A = this chain, B = another copy of it.
Amino acid sequence: YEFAEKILFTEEEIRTRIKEVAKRIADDYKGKGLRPYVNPLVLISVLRGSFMFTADLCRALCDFNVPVRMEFICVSSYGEGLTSSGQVRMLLDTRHSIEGHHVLIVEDIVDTALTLNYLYHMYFTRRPASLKTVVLLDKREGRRVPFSADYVVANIPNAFVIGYGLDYDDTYRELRDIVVLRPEVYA
């Protein structure tokens, strides 16, 4: 791992926390009567980074018997200095309607929050029975617009992290652990 300045979390620590987050979620929804086919917890996994987080979480949720529905969405930048408001081009949206459904947006990391806030406001207008967010890493200090995630696996300083789905120039997504990219490397 000589491209990393430090180890933030190992696969094990990540695993543990996810299970804790999943258990909290399960309790929080114990009342909503979530049932397969008719009333599942919809996970709108925001591609690409979220793919790894989403895979381990839906399984943790399953441990706690939470019936889920995976929706993968792919967004795209309109270009630098074109929106500011975090507007993104929807390349692939949910296959099913979220209207009347309990929805949970899944992101691997919230930093400036521009996109996540835009998405939250977007799905919010589609009238789901409820709408919350789960994010693996939260850079609380990086906000460019105010935004609070309902569930967070870990808060992190403003370091550039990689691994567990997170990349730098499309590299390192496959790492089992979350680490900090060495400044020597990204230079």
Binding site for B on A (CB under 8 A): 36-37, 40, 45, 47-48, 51-52, 54-56, 58-59, 61-63, 67-70, 72, 74, 76, 91-92, 95-96, 169-176
B74 adjacent to A92 (CB under 8 Å): yes
**Copy count, this protein chain:** 2
CB pair A171–B69 under 8 Å, yes or no, is: yes
The answer, among B63, B69, B72, for a CB contact under 8 Å with A47, is B72
- Chain B residues with Cβ below 8 Å from A175 are 59, 62
Decide yes or no: A173 and B72 within 8 Å by CB, A45-B51, A51-B45, A92-B91 being known contacts: no
**Besides A54-B55, A58-B173, A61-B174, 10 other A-B contacts (C-beta < 8 A):** A40-B171, A45-B51, A47-B72, A51-B72, A59-B174, A67-B171, A68-B174, A69-B171, A76-B95, A92-B92
A-B contacts, 11 of them at CB < 8 A, read: A36-B171, A37-B171, A40-B170, A48-B70, A51-B55, A52-B58, A59-B176, A62-B175, A62-B176, A70-B174, A76-B95
Q: 4 nearest interchain CB pairs?
A: A55-B55, A58-B174, A62-B174, A92-B92
| With A51-B54, A51-B55, A52-B55: A70-B173 Cβ-Cβ less than 8 Å | yes
Which of A45, A51, A72, A174 gathers the greatest number of chain B CB atoms within 10 Å? A174
B72 engages A48 (CB within 8 Å): yes
Q: A61-B174, A96-B170, A174-B61 are in contact. Are A70 and B91 (CB under 8 A)?
A: no
Q: List residues of chain B with CB within 8 A of the CB of A74.
A: 72, 74, 92
A37 B174 Cβ-Cβ under 8 A: no
Q: Which of A59, A68, A172, A175 has the most CB of B within 10 A?
A: A59
Output the nearest chain B residue to A169 by Cβ-Cβ distance.
Answer: B37
